[PDB]
Amino acid sequence: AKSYVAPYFEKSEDETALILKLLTYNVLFSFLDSRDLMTVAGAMWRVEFKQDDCIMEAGQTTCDKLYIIQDGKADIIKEGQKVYLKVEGTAVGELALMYQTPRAATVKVCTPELIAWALDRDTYRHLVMGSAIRRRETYIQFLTNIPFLSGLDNYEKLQLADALSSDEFEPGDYIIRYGEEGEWLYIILEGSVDVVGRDDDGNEKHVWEFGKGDHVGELEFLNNHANVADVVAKTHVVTAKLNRRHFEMCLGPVIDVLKRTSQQPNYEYYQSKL
Ligand SMILES: Nc1ncnc2c1ncn2[C@@H]1O[C@@H]2COP(=O)(O)O[C@H]2[C@H]1O
Numbered sequence: 001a002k003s004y005v006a007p008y009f010e011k012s013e014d015e016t017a018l019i020l021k022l023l024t025y026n027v028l029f030s031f032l033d034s035r036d037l038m039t040v041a042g043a044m045w046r047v048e049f050k051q052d053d054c055i056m057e058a059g060q061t062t063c064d065k066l067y068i069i070q071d072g073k074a075d076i077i078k079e080g081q082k083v084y085l086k087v088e089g090t091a092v093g094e095l096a097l098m099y100q101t102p103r104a105a106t107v108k109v110c111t112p113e114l115i116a117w118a119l120d121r122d123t124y125r126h127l128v129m130g131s132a133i134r135r136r137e138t139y140i141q142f143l144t145n146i147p148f149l150s151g152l153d154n155y156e157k158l159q160l161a162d163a164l165s166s167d168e169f170e171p172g173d174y175i176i177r178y179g180e181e182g183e184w185l186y187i188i189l190e191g192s193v194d195v196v197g198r199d200d201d202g203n204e205k206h207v208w209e210f211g212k213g214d215h216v217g218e219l220e221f222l223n224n225h226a227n228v229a230d231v232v233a234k235t236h237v238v239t240a241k242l243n244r245r246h247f248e249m250c251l252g253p254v255i256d257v258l259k260r261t262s263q264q265p266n267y268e269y270y271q272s273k274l
């Protein structure tokens with residue numbers, strides 16, 4: 001991990017800046033610092049495809065690159081059926097580079113053009129991958145039991161795991177602080193928490209108690225406002241958190257469920273804050 005020298009491929013400073021924006025939202029790069037992000041972007045090169053081009057084909061064994069889509073879209077096709085639609089900013093060909101397997105599916109361009117940014121297997125495995133498989137596999141056992149994640153398919157739960165990181169809190173620790181910017185959605189894996197808002201007069205007000213499998217922090221993501229309450233650990237608590245920049249990338253399919261949840265009777269407090 002230390003002595004690996006990535007290739008550098010010629011590109012303009014505009015292309016590098018465009019790449020960095022992509023790496024910012026795609027979860028494969030969630031935990032890279034500035035320098036490794038700069039080096040990963042140096043190690044990438046632009047490719048182009050036409051409609052119906054197969055960027056890769058199920059069962060192939062030369063698998064020495066993944067791609068990050070800048071523009072256009074691609075179908076993911078297993079056993080002849082389209083199973084998944086890959087859109088701008090997402091990755092294709094990452095599974096074979098992570099698990100050293102043949103391509104799990106055909107990837108076929110379904111827009112007139114597709115522009116994507118390619119990355120070789122060695123630079124990914126060495127600079128990017130890190131503990132992604134250990135991280136995926138530690139979280140997935142929990143994730144399949146989180147109720148609001150039921151609308152994420154299996155591929156999407158493992159993708160969310162690429163962007164999660166965990167924390168331990170002690171009784172009385174502030175996980176979320178009232179009036180500050182919401183930056184993390186927390187999934188509770190062990191313990192209990194209190195939601196503490198304020199009334200009109202500004203007094204502390206107990207709102208709700210949440211536990212294992214619950215989620216907090218997403219209200220400020222949905223409707224772009226300051227934290228409406230504290231969230232305080234009642235017990236020794238353990239959480240996985242998702243950064244705001246990965247919110248839509250990872251939770252797109254259950255966003256409508258989070259909005260439904262925010263109109264339930266236990267968000268009456270939050271309801272009257274507008
Ligand atoms: N269920 C799936 N959902 C979304 N994308 C998939 C799925 N299966 C395969 N793919 C994508 O298709 C790619 C085909 O090659 P890879 O297996 O290297 O990496 C794969 C993923 O990028």
Ligand SMILES: O=c1[nH]cnc2c1ncn2[C@@H]1O[C@H](CO)[C@@H](O)[C@H]1O
Nearest residue numbers: 216217218219228229266267269270
């Ligand atoms: O009325 C509420 N009911 C239930 N949970 C709430 C309510 N208001 C806020 N939170 C929780 O506390 C976080 C900090 O603002 C919110 O993002 C939400 O998860």
